[PDB]
From a paper:
We demonstrated that the TCR from the 1E6 T cell clone bound to HLA-A*0201–ALWGPDPAAA using a limited footprint and very weak binding affinity. Here, we solved the structure of the 1E6 TCR with 7 altered peptide ligands (APLs) determined by our previously published combinatorial peptide library (CPL) screening, 2 of which mapped within human pathogens. Concomitant with our global analysis of 1E6 TCR binding to the APLs, we observed a common interaction element, consistent with our previous findings, that utilized TCR residues Tyr97α and Trp97β, forming an aromatic cap over a central GPD motif that was present in all of the APLs. Ligand engagement is dominated by peptide interactions, but hotspot-like interactions with the central GPD motif enable the 1E6 TCR to tolerate peptide residues that vary outside of this region, explaining how T cells expressing this TCR may cross-react with a large number of different peptides.
The low number of contacts between the 2 molecules most likely contributed to the weak binding affinity of the interaction. In order to examine the mechanism by which the 1E6 TCR engaged a wide range of peptides with divergent binding affinities, we solved the structure of the 1E6 TCR in complex with all 7 APLs used in Figure 2. Overall, the 1E6 TCR used a canonical binding mode to engage each APL with the TCR α-chain positioned over the MHC class I (MHCI) α2-helix and the TCR β-chain over the MHCI α-1 helix, straddling the peptide cargo. For example, the 1E6 TCR bound to A2-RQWGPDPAAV with the third strongest affinity (KD = 7.8 μM) but made fewer contacts than with A2-ALWGPDPAAA (KD = ~208 μM). For example, the 1E6 TCR made 64 peptide contacts with A2-YLGGPDFPTI (KD = ~400 μM) compared with 43 contacts with A2-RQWGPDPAAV (KD = 7.8 μM). The stronger ligands all encoded larger side chains (Arg or Tyr) at peptide position 1, enabling interactions with 1E6 that were not present in the weaker APLs that lacked large side chains in this position. Conversely, the stronger-affinity ligands A2-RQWGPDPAAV (KD = 7.8 μM), A2-YQFGPDFPIA (KD = 7.4 μM), and A2-RQFGPDFPTI (KD = 0.5 μM) exhibited favorable entropy (TΔS° = 2.2 to 14.9 kcal/mol), indicating an order-to-disorder change during binding, possibly through the expulsion of ordered water molecules. The unligated structures of A2-AQWGPDAAA, A2-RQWGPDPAAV, A2-YQFGPDFPIA, and A2-RQFGPDFPTI were virtually identical when in complex with 1E6.
Author numbering:
A (entry chain B): 0 to 99
B (entry chain A): 1 to 276
C (entry chain D): 3 to 191
D (entry chain E): 3 to 246
E (entry chain C): 1 to 10
Write the structure that this text describes.
């Protein structure tokens, strides 16, 4: 009968280099119950054909999932992860900060 | 170094659709090797690591019917549990299970475990000794009585001390260049100023396997946790992992801080200082 | 695969009986024995989880997972132990049992007062036709088959007014015609 | 316990055969087995909560099993073939009994799928009275019953006396033997035996009857031979007490 | 390799 809001980490797989192929990750964790929605965004617009790992859970029973795609970062393109979940009353956006 | 085999199972009831959602995964250490998902089309245990692929059809047939049969159990558990707690049939509820085996550096048995949760809270767990149960609840008490009467502990004890630890050894061998490899962390450091009097130092570790690392900032040779923040370690997505550790410092004196990186694949622990 | 000798075993009452099976798939972990009277369902006897040896009454079941060999012993066997015996096994992935083909067990009654006697009996209605029953004979006695195809000999069978325990064997032979009327039946083994 | 039907089926190949099972109330596992009268069972399939779990033993072709609800399972063969003849057993259990290897069995369906119903025959049945020698050589009296000429081999013989079913003193044959072992498919015979004291035989109030139940054609089956439809029937013979 | 054939009901 209890809820927990997801932590969200947005990050690349390899150190980001403009014009070089890479993977954009969004890792959601600490959440319960299990339904969540997660989008990766390119300038506010949703990236089609994202993938995710199989639902698992930690010691405290909370869930976690990795969502990801290939992308090619640039100087000006903004990226972000958008999360919705019953503990949120509107989708939560966290921007990718390449130094992070 | 020591090792584990663990399975994780989640079923979620869904009133007004036909069956609970059921997701099963298996790991050895930090590397999944199997999955099943009741909504996917194959309806089979699927391999997720190259070394279980060599197992033949008997094994796949057997693993797939055990996992379907396990989701059948959880179908019954969802309705039993709604009844134990008198809950409305209108609401969606969650059953989770995880059970597993650790062995030590000598690959002998260290411990088994089998734990169960309802709506993300502890329900019953098999105690260390594998003879005995703790129950969170009076609902959990009557299940415990059920399980004692049916000698569930005994079978689990035979599984965990036998088959389980045995199959863990077999996997460690077949997957040795993947499971018995260490990817030593690629490290580096960044600097950003926070304020007039303050700047933050972030110490990075990338591409390591397995996931355990300890990242610590020393100051003049001594531990520094006051104003230290570790992020949760995180999958790179390629089988490897990443973590960083940050420190908040009186700026100017960036050189007074040393980051310390410990990981199985590091012959000696690693020291890092900001040179500008 | 589970190999089991079909028999039949014929044993005198009181004898120790030994039954067994071999298999080839390691990972069989649960081993069991069933008894099945003829025309009935299989009845569970004894059941041994990897666990060597398991005594109950006159029955002991054993398992050797190295030699992949499994056995059941019955001490002081009795007429009512007469049945086919089947071994069955599984692993831990399915409740599917694999059975051996069964061993038929005959425990011969010990006739305390043998009385080798051949009778004739009247057909209940208007028919000068009938049968010759050999009764009350001994357990060592095998009632063997025919010479020609125009007499018909049924096997021996074990009748008992139980609790008032007088046991008794009887065969039956017959033919349509005078010409082989209460003539030779010939026991040999 | 577990209830199966039919207990007996005789049919021509080509026909759809359907077998049914009701597990013990509360049992949520159910098993279908088959035994060809030579060997051990084989598992055809089992279900857990009406869902098929292990299918391994189901024939590749004319066989399908269903469990539309928790109290009811069917196994269907279409079309049926002679190699299908067998005793089909249903069984059910619960986890706590299966962990100790215990299941509960139905009484079985006995199935003969025959090539030509033209080979079906009911038995002729006769009773033979105790020997005019035995009565005083031993002071006991044995009746003999002899069912002959039947095909196929689905017969049940019981003794009745004064109109109550009798068990003590009864030894009926374990197997019904082939009237002509020459032919693979041949007519069958079978005997039984009832013993009482000389004093029970000799008293006139006593009605001995050998009752033989035969399983053969049913209403549905076609028939156009000149002889009587070899329908499933009770055929019987009779004998009376007397100090003659 | 999983525990089986299946877990006991709650």
């Amino acid at each position: 009968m209890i809820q927990r809001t997801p932590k969200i980490q947005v990050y690349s797989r390899h150190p980001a280099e403009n014009g070089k192929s890479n993977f954009l990750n969004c890792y959601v964790s600490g959440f319960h119950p299990s339904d969540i929605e997660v989008d990766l965004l390119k300038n506010g617009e949703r990236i089609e054909k994202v993938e995710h790992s199989d639902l698992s859970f930690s010691k405290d029973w909370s869930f976690y999932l990795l969502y990801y795609t290939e992308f090619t970062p640039t100087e000006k393109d903004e990226y972000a992860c958008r999360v919705n979940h019953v503990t949120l009353s509107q989708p939560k956006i966290v921007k990718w900060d390449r130094d992070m | 170094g020591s090792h584990s085999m663990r399975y994780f199972f989640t079923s979620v009831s869904r009133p007004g659709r036909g069956e609970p959602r059921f997701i099963a995964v298996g790991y050895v250490d930090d590397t999944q090797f199997v999955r099943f998902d009741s909504d996917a089309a194959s309806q089979r245990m699927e391999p997720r690591a190259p070394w279980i692929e060599q197992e033949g059809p008997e094994y796949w047939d057997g693993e797939t019917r055990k996992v379907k049969a396990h989701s059948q159990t959880h179908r019954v558990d969802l309705g039993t549990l709604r009844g134990y707690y008198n809950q409305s049939e209108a609401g969606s509820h969650t059953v989770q299970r995880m059970y597993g085996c650790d062995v030590g550096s000598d690959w002998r048995f260290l411990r088994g475990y089998h734990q169960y949760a309802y709506d993300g809270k502890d329900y019953i767990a098999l105690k260390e000794d594998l003879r005995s149960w703790t129950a969170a609840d009076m609902a959990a008490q009557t299940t415990k009585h059920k399980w004692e009467a049916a000698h569930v502990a005994e079978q689990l004890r035979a599984y965990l001390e036998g088959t389980c630890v045995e199959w863990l050894r077999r996997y460690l061998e077949n997957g040795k260049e993947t499971l018995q490899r260490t990817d030593a962390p690629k490290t580096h450091m960044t600097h950003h100023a926070v304020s007039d009097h303050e700047a933050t130092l972030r110490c990075w570790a990338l591409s390591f396997y397995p996931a355990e690392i300890t990242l610590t900032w020393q100051r003049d040779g001594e531990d520094q946790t006051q104003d230290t923040e570790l992020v949760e370690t995180r999958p790179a997505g390629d089988g490897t992992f990443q973590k960083w550790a940050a420190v908040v410092v009186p700026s100017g004196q960036e050189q007074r801080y040393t980051c310390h990186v410990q990981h199985e694949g590091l012959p000696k622990p690693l020291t890092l200082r900001w040179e500008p | 695969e589970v190999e089991q000798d079909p028999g039949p075993l014929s044993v005198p009452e009181g004898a120790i009986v030994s039954l067994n099976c071999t298999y080839s798939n390691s990972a069989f972990q649960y081993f069991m024995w069933y008894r099945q009277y003829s025309r009935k369902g299989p009845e569970l006897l004894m059941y041994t989880y990897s666990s060597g040896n398991k005594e109950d009454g006159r029955f002991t079941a054993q398992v050797d997972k190295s030699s992949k060999y499994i056995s059941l012993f019955i001490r002081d066997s009795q007429p009512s132990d007469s049945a086919t015996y089947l071994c069955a096994m599984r692993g831990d992935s399915s409740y599917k049992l694999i059975f051996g083909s069964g061993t038929r067990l005959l425990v011969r009654p010990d006739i305390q007062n043998p009385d080798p006697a051949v009778y004739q009996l009247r057909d209940s209605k208007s028919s000068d036709k009938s049968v010759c029953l050999f009764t009350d004979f001994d357990s060592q006695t095998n009632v063997s088959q025919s010479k020609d195809s125009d007499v018909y000999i049924t096997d021996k069978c074990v009748l008992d007014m139980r609790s008032m325990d007088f046991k008794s064997n009887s065969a039956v032979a017959w033919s349509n015609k005078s010409d082989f009327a209460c003539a030779n039946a010939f026991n040999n083994s | 316990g577990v209830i199966q039907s039919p207990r007996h089926e005789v049919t021509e190949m080509g026909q759809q055969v359907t077998l049914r099972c009701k597990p013990i109330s509360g049992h949520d596992y159910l098993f279908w087995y088959r035994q060809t009268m030579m060997r051990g069972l084989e598992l055809l399939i089992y279900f857990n909560n009406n869902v098929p779990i292990d299918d391994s033993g189901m024939p590749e072709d004319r066989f399908s099993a269903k469990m539309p609800n928790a109290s009811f399972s069917t196994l269907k063969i279409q079309p049926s073939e002679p190699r299908d003849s067998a005793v089909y057993f249903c069984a059910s259990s619960l986890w706590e009994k299966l962990a100790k290897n215990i299941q509960y069995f139905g009484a079985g369906t006995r199935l003969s799928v025959l090539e030509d119903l033209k080979n079906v025959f009911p038995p002729e049945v006769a009773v033979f009275e105790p020997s005019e020698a035995e009565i005083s050589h031993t002071q006991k009296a044995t009746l003999v019953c002899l069912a002959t000429g039947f095909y196929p081999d689905h017969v049940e013989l019981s003794w009745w006396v004064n109109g109550k079913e009798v068990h003590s003193g009864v030894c009926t044959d374990p197997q019904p033997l082939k009237e002509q072992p020459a032919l693979n498919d041949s007519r069958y015979a079978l005997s039984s035996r009832l013993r009482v004291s000389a004093t029970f035989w000799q008293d006139p109030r006593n009605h001995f009857r050998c009752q033989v139940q035969f399983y053969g054609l049913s209403e549905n089956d076609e028939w156009t031979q000149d002889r009587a439809k070899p329908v499933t029937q009770i055929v019987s013979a009779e004998a009376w007490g007397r100090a003659d | 390799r999983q525990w089986g054939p299946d877990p006991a009901a709650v």
